[PDB]
Design an enzyme around this catalytic site. Structure first.
Site, PDB file in Angstrom:
ATOM      1  N   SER A  48      -0.723  15.562 -11.964  1.00  0.00           N
ATOM      2  CA  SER A  48      -0.807  15.146 -13.411  1.00  0.00           C
ATOM      3  C   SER A  48      -1.296  16.527 -14.147  1.00  0.00           C
ATOM      4  CB  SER A  48      -2.054  14.220 -13.397  1.00  0.00           C
ATOM      5  OG  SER A  48      -2.334  14.126 -14.701  1.00  0.00           O
ATOM      6  N   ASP A  91       0.894  -1.225  -0.117  1.00  0.00           N
ATOM      7  CA  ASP A  91      -0.027  -0.057  -0.040  1.00  0.00           C
ATOM      8  C   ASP A  91       1.055   1.357  -0.053  1.00  0.00           C
ATOM      9  OD1 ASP A  91      -1.934   1.700   0.099  1.00  0.00           O
ATOM     10  OD2 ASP A  91      -2.431   1.411   2.358  1.00  0.00           O
TER      11      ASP A  91
END
Length: 330
Positions: free
Chosen positions: A199, A35
């Site tokens: 992004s 994770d």
């Protein structure tokens, strides 16, 4: 040193991925959910409330000659989905894919939430976010990666998740045969303890690319792609009959649909998520309403590039003094 381990979907939907991890002496092999959105290595154990164990493999520290109680240490974690677990702490030898760390904090669960009990395939989590998020008290502990880093050939790990197929986690090296083209690296902020990056935009299907900054985290421990409501609405508007369902808890779409791809930007590069990756199947057995793999982050407070996004790429988690993230197509 290096390590290399195969990671395997837990089910036919890629709801999560499990990776075998050797703990203790002799080794006890548990299948953990790696994770990159949390920083605790915790396991089902011989200390876990009996009624809360249902099919998981447990760690038994009393059977490990290298286990030692970390005296006074406790831990307690709550995840974004509402799941949780807590307990006490041992140090022991932990190996992943041939890479060994001695003195790793292994957090033994005394209690786990129902969602963990109900999933027999996940024996615990191995956190790979920054150690500043580790929950052990009163002395915070380091992640497996942070402990391993100095010994690694290069201070990196990579995630290469498969679509409906096994993939690989590598530690200490970049497998140049595992991706196509070049790796595009992008800046990371560690201020919130995550692999947080920005992004450069998105496209839906064959549509034009929208340049827009989208701050979010690279999170292997989250199944879906969670993005701003504007972006998610633009995606689902291209699927006839798709709608946001408050009763189901997100966007659903007719199971008869052909889903468009979704592209996200990494600098001037582009990662394309095929439409099939966005199908999470019937909302309940036999239903013709299917659950979407792109969902709104509104209310979460952060955008999450979970497995839906990451599995479309070869992803480098660069833990150099100034961390960065790399993405390549594959």
């Amino acid at each position: 040193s290096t390590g290399s381990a195969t990671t395997t979907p837990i089910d036919s939907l890629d709801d999560a991925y499990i990776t075998p991890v050797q703990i203790g002496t002799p080794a006890q092999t548990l299948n953990l959910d790696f994770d990159t959105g949390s920083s605790d290595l915790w396991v089902f154990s011989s200390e876990t409330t009996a009624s809360e164990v249902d099919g998981q493999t447990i760690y038994t520290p009393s059977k490990s000659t290298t286990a030692k109680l970390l005296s006074g240490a406790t831990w307690s974690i709550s995840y974004g989905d509402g799941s949780s677990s807590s307990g006490d702490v041992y140090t022991d030898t932990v190996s992943v894919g041939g890479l060994t760390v001695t003195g790793q904090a292994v957090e033994s669960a005394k209690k786990v939430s129902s969602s963990f009990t109900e999933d027999s395939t996940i024996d615990g989590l191995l956190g790979l976010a920054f150690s500043t998020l580790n929950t052990v008290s009163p002395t915070q502990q380091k992640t497996f990666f942070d402990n391993a880093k100095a010994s690694l050939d290069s201070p990196v790990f990579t995630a290469d998740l498969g679509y409906h197929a096994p993939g690989t986690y590598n530690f200490g090296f970049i497998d140049t045969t595992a991706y196509t083209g070049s790796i595009t690296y992008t800046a990371v902020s560690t201020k919130q303890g995550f692999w947080e990056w920005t992004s450069t935009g998105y496209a839906v299907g064959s549509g034009t690319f929208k340049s827009t900054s989208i701050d979010g985290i690279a999170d292997t421990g989250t199944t879906l792609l969670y993005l701003p409501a504007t972006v998610v609405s633009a995606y689902w508007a291209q699927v006839s009959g798709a709608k946001s369902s408050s009763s189901v808890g997100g966007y659903v779409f007719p199971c008869s649909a052909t889903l468009p791809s979704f592209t996200f930007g990494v600098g001037s590069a582009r990662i394309v998520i095929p439409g099939d990756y966005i199908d999470f199947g019937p909302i309940s057995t036999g239903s013709s309403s299917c659950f979407g793999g792109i969902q709104s982050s509104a209310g979460i407070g952060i955008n999450i590039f979970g497995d839906v996004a990451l599995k479309a790429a070869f992803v480098v988690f660069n833990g150099a003094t100034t961390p960065t993230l790399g993405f390549a197509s594959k």
